[PDB]
Amino acid sequence: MRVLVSNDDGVDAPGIKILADALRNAGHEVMVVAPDRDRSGASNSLTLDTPIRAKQIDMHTYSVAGTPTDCVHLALTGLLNYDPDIVVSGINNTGNLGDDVIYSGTVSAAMEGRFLGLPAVAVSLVTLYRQAPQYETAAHAAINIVAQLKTDPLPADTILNVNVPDVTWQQMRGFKVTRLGNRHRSAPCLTQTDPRGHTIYWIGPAGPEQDAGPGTDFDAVRNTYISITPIHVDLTRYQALENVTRWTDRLTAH
Amino acid sequence: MRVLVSNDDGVDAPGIKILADALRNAGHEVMVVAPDRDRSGASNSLTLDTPIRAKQIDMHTYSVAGTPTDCVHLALTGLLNYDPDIVVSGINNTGNLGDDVIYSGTVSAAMEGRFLGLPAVAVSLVTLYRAPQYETAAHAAINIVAQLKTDPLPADTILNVNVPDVTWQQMRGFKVTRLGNRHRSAPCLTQTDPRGHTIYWIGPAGPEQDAGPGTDFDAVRNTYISITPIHVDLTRYQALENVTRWTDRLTAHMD
Amino acid sequence: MRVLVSNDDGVDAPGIKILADALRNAGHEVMVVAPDRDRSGASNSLTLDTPIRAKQIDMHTYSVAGTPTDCVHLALTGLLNYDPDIVVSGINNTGNLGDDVIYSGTVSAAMEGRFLGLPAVAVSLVTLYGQQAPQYETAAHAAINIVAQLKTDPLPADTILNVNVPDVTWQQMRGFKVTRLGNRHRSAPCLTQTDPRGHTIYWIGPAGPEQDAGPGTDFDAVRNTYISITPIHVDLTRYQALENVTRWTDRLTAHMD
Amino acid sequence: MRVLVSNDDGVDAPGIKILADALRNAGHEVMVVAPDRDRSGASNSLTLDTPIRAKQIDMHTYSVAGTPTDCVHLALTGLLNYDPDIVVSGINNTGNLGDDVIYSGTVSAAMEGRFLGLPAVAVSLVTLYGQQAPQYETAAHAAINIVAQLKTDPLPADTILNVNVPDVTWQQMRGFKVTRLGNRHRSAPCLTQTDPRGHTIYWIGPAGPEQDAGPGTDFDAVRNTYISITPIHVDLTRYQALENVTRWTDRLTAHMD
Ligand SMILES: [Mn+2]
Ligand SMILES: [Mn+2]
Ligand SMILES: [Mn+2]
Ligand SMILES: [Mn+2]
């Protein structure tokens, strides 16, 4: 199938190169439209106030001086004579798990892909802070997910957030559908003093009160499972609408 | 009630000052923990790799050199001897509507407020530019906060509020909305910068935009305060049982 | 005279409002062209890859979504129907001293002023942080005093003044002092600490005693409550090195291994 | 000799890998301490408000989540058990010429090298954008040739070399040329265009004919297929201006208005 591949680590990131190579090996057409530089931990929103510069790097590769969402958006709205069936974003050089996902650049690209009407998959390698990162494994996971989606499509308002354990494929215990975890809640605040004497604050390490037990994406990748979290792209809480609608009439009554 | 107020325009933004002032006028205790500078269009994720510096500005105000989520997170996890019942983020100097909301700094602050277990409300003034009625959004805010004291939100839910940049009298009312979508329509414009390079504008949202009745766009366009209850948990639970079968295959045969 | 005022702390910075007002109260005409937000930790170079938006806040104030150099550049190249005699950048909320000067946003605006052929002054408040209030008026007083002088005593070729003002009242100020740039970087060791996770992080330590902050330097001046004025290059070309480098450069033209 | 290699395009940049390898193939020991990501449009100043993470990619390569100056600083102040004789920063994917030099990330790393007492060279490839491939080998060849010379001919006090390499094969290269910094900023007008919405935006225009890119300048050299070597100040202090500024500064000790 026609795959549009982006990332947020940059168009020259080893992750996206290996992902694209893998996807072509599987028989897929792969256009790559990805940031000129690493924009991990940068804002993810579509650039609207300035024009975006996009140079071509090869016949299948574009380097966009903009966000990952800019990339996919440009890629799907005129930058290419290319109608991809799917958007694959990755492979991220770090995992994107739990409440980090909402602000993940890698995920943002996939979200834009779904915003513009395409099945999208975010792929992140859960590299541990410790040797070379097993991008081949995530790429392996990717080409397998893409294949299954060709014959079995995702629901509407849904992308797949995929996290792959930084191990060989043989060492992978398998695929595991998960919900998003939560490490923010537990993470306390640490008051310390920098060398210049200023008071600084560390977001503390996530305590035991973390939502990282069974069923979470954390728990999966921790136990060497490829985590597949189907996530919203529409943030609207429809379940709370009629309840807020009834709440708002009470609000406006007063 | 005890209100924690943040924003993403900065601690000195007129929006947040007016919001805090209003909320105190309503009788609420208001701690303000907000970015040192404008971080609109900056990354929203919790800072973890570096420590955050937070100076106190007054007895109720903290200037945090970090993200809006850093602000609320620090504010709720040790920076304050203060247990707020609610987190109000705003007032944003621009509206946060449709598919912009996911990446809104103002919304991010409210998200963290709910992540840490508090009812949260994002407040944005829908300003079109060529003075901005912050007082109106602040009035909308203090009214929303009041109703939440006696009528609480569901779990995994914050309120994304957008207020038309008009006087309160000119406001047609409150309207619960779903998130719109302007991205889909927005095409790509190829143009040439003065130095000759090929540049690309994200085109203006065409008629194919999801901004009709029921959307937050349509509400604020027609001078209604838009209240969109949004997810905090992005997990698509309705797709869990669906994509599991899809996955079982893969987790069975491996190669 | 006509003054173009900028900074890097933002058009809303108290340092620039106070500077501009002081300069107006002194009888100068003052256009303020300054960043929309604080860019004290941003790149200083001219924005070329993208266009720059300039919002006019009032008659004599422009908010520019770009670098301090962008501000001055735009202001001097057609944004304004205005012909300034001098560029004054500041007042920076923090000091800009020694080997920090070269990467200062404040100084960058002054740099661009000189690049475009204008006398320029960077004004920074050496704040040490602690309440009260930042003595921007003091720095402003210094600024209008310095600007008065450049009206009569022109700066030499490719020179701007880097001015640092001790964060004190004007009455406490011992005076003005012409200074050279100090050096604190070499004396700043690398401190190897560990984050909460246990992972090793590296702080750049505070400047030790081996720093170049003795007599004649800007550091020494401002620490002794003296307004420091450092005339600084805008032309980085080490001209006195040209002849020397030329000598072994000529040999390299014989392209070998 | 022992070379500390950095850049601003990132530790994964082809320009720095090729530079480092060339320098090793020349028999130098080479530690690479370079940003984790491309920071070509980032601030250059030392990170002081936060700690810096350094990841060791291999024996002679460190990935640093901080500025180019952070890299060199850390590398020279305790990150490494390594005592380099020279700092070489590059190879930048784009040229760093004239009035742009002062804000160059590449140059910034070299700056910090000199600040910490080391001979330093900034190496940039004057790429003009055309497919093929960026001639980093050419620049690398230039680098190892220049580094060989500084082993024997030491640079003067507070001087680094700003080296720009024409994006050509080594055989096309006409030679090396000692140059002064050119000036394109003054010749770069402000172009007032309008975005799709109709709102007015301001481009900084391309450098017109009034630019300082004539003979003797770095621009002229690289445009004529010459490797440009500009010795540049690391000490921005305009020493030749000290006496002059001192003359009207002493007056200002009359502080009452
Ligand atoms: Mn990434
Ligand atoms: Mn904002
Ligand atoms: Mn500043
Ligand atoms: Mn660069």
The token pair at A190 is: 């640490």
The answer to whether the Cβ–Cβ distance between C51 and A50 falls below 8 Å is yes
The answer for A181, left when phi > 0, alpha when psi is -120 to 50, beta otherwise, is beta
Q: Who's near C229: CB < 8 A, 6+ residues apart?
A: C146, C161, C162, C163, C176, C177, C178, C179, D245, D249
B130 Cβ under 8 Å from any chain C Cβ: no
Contact A163, A97 (CB under 8 A): yes
Task: Report the CATH superfamily, name and number, of domain A1-254.
Answer: Survival protein SurE-like phosphatase/nucleotidase (3.40.1210.10)
Contact C143, C23 (CB under 8 A): yes
Strand B198-202 relative to strand B224-230, pairing: unpaired
Contact D124, D198 (CB under 8 A): no
The residue among C99, C170, C156 whose CA lies nearest residue C107 is C99
Other beta carbons within 10 Å of D133: 8
The answer to whether the Cβ–Cβ distance between A194 and D49 falls below 8 Å is yes
Among candidates D49, D196, D206 on the partner chain, residue whose Cβ is nearest the Cβ of B194: D206
Q: How far apart are CA A112 and CA A96, in angstroms?
A: 17
Q: In this structure, which amino acid lies at residue B201?
A: W
Other beta carbons within 10 Å of A1: 16
Contact C190, C196 (CB under 8 A): no
B36 in a known ligand binding site:
no
A92 in a known ligand binding site:
yes
CA distance C234 to chain A (A): 30
B82 Cβ under 8 Å from any chain A Cβ: no
Supply the CATH classification number for the domain C1-257. Answer: 3.40.1210.10
The residue among C252, C3, C248 whose CA lies nearest residue C121 is C3
Q: Kindly report the CA angle at B62 between B56 and B67, in degrees rounded to 5?
A: 130
Q: Which ligand is nearest to the CA of A13?
A: 1
**Tokens 């170049």 correspond to what residue?**
C212
CA distance C93 to chain B (A): 13
A36 Cβ under 8 Å from any chain D Cβ: yes
Contact C8, C38 (CB under 8 A): yes
Q: How far apart are CA C201 and CA D74, in angstroms?
A: 11
Nearest CA in chain C to A65: C49
Q: Would you give the end-to-end CA distance of chain A in angstroms?
A: 56
List beta partners, residue C56.
C62
Q: Considering only residues 100 to 129 of chain D, which have any Cβ-Cβ distance to chain C shorter than 8 Å?
A: 100-104, 108, 111-112, 115-117
The residue among A139, A135, A159, A134 whose CA lies nearest residue A149 is A159
Q: Would you give the end-to-end CA distance of chain C in angstroms?
A: 58
3-state secondary structure B60-72: CEEEECCCHHHHH
Among candidates A53, A190, A195 on the partner chain, residue whose Cβ is nearest the Cβ of C196: A190
Q: Which ligand is nearest to the CA of D100?
A: 4
Q: How far apart are CA A95 and CA A40, in angstroms?
A: 12
Contact C31, C3 (CB under 8 A): yes
Q: How far apart are CA B77 and CA D43, in angstroms?
A: 31
Burial of B97-124, coded b for 16+ CB within 10 Å and e otherwise, reads: bbbbbbbbbbbbbbbbbbbbebbbbbbb
3-state secondary structure B94-109: CCCCHHHHHHCHHHHH
Q: Kindly report the CA angle at B237 between B234 and B240, in degrees rounded to 5?
A: 120
Torsion angle of the four alpha carbons D206, D212, D216, D220, in this order, in degrees rounded to the nearest 10:
20
Contact C22, C141 (CB under 8 A): yes
* Coil vs helix vs strand at B209: coil
Contact C33, C80 (CB under 8 A): yes
Q: Kindly report the CA angle at C19 between C15 and C22, in degrees rounded to 5?
A: 140
Length, in residues, of chain C: 257
The token pair at A117 is: 């009407």
The residue among D29, D39, D55, D51 whose CA lies nearest residue D7 is D39
Q: Which ligand is nearest to the CA of C106?
A: 3
Chains that touch B (3 or more CB pairs under 8 A): A, C, D
> How far does CA D135 lie from the centroid of its chain?
17
> How far does CA D201 lie from the centroid of its chain?
30
Gaps in chain B (C to N distance exceeding 2.5 A) after = 130
Q: How far apart are CA D194 and CA D199, in angstroms?
A: 5
Other beta carbons within 10 Å of C49: 18
Q: Give the Å distance between the CA of B205 and the centre of ligand 4.
A: 35
Å resolution of this model? Answer: 2.8
Q: How far apart are CA B63 and CA B6, in angstroms?
A: 10
Q: Kindly report the CA angle at D214 between D213 and D217, in degrees rounded to 5?
A: 70
The token pair at C157 is: 């070729």
The token pair at C173 is: 């100020």
CA distance B173 to chain D (A): 30
Of C237, C250, C251, C256, which to mutate for an interface test with D (greatest number of D Cβ within 10 Å)? C237
CATH of region B1-255, choose from 1.20.120.530, 3.40.1210.10, 3.40.50.920, 2.30.42.10: 3.40.1210.10
The answer for D63, left when phi > 0, alpha when psi is -120 to 50, beta otherwise, is beta
C65 Cβ under 8 Å from any chain A Cβ: yes
CA distance C46 to chain B (A): 14
CA atoms within 13 Å, Cβ hemisphere of C131: 5
C225 Cβ under 8 Å from any chain D Cβ: no
Among candidates D43, D181, D247 on the partner chain, residue whose Cβ is nearest the Cβ of C43: D43
Q: How far apart are CA A122 and CA A138, in angstroms?
A: 11
Q: How far apart are CA C29 and CA B52, in angstroms?
A: 41
A174 Cβ under 8 Å from any chain C Cβ: no
Contact A53, A81 (CB under 8 A): no
> How far does CA B172 lie from the centroid of its chain?
22
Among candidates A14, A38, A55 on the partner chain, residue whose Cβ is nearest the Cβ of D37: A38
What residues in A contact B155, CB-CB < 8 Å? none
Strand B158-164 relative to strand B224-230, pairing: antiparallel
The answer to whether the Cβ–Cβ distance between C197 and A190 falls below 8 Å is no
B85 in a known ligand binding site:
no
The residue among D217, D230, D206 whose CA lies nearest residue D182 is D217
Contact A125, A93 (CB under 8 A): yes
The residue among A78, A77, A67, A96 whose CA lies nearest residue A6 is A67
The answer to whether the Cβ–Cβ distance between A52 and B144 falls below 8 Å is no
The answer to whether the Cβ–Cβ distance between D38 and A36 falls below 8 Å is yes
At residue C91, φ and ψ (nearest 5 deg) are -90, 125
What residues in B contact A200, CB-CB < 8 Å? 51-53
Helix (H) or strand (E) holding D25: helix D14-25
Q: How far apart are CA D108 and CA D71, in angstroms?
A: 10
Measured CA distances, A236 to A182, A230, A239, C118 (Å): 20, 16, 9, 55
At residue C194, φ and ψ (nearest 5 deg) are -130, 135
Q: In this structure, which amino acid lies at residue B34?
A: A
A43 in a known ligand binding site:
no
Among candidates A37, A51, A55 on the partner chain, residue whose Cβ is nearest the Cβ of D37: A37
The token pair at B57 is: 């500005």
Length, in residues, of chain A: 254
Contact D238, C156 (CB under 8 A): yes
Helix (H) or strand (E) holding D192: strand D190-194
Q: How far apart are CA A21 and CA A140, in angstroms?
A: 11
Q: How was this model experimentally determined? A: X-ray
CA distance C14 to chain D (A): 22
Q: DSSP of C112-157, one letter per residue? A: HHHHTT--EEEEEEE-----S---HHHHHHHHHHHHHHHTTS---T
CA distance D14 to chain C (A): 22
Q: Give the Å distance between the CA of A168 and the centre of ligand 4.
A: 35
Among candidates D51, D115, D178 on the partner chain, residue whose Cβ is nearest the Cβ of C201: D51
B65 Cβ under 8 Å from any chain D Cβ: yes
Contact C203, A195 (CB under 8 A): yes
Contact A17, A93 (CB under 8 A): no
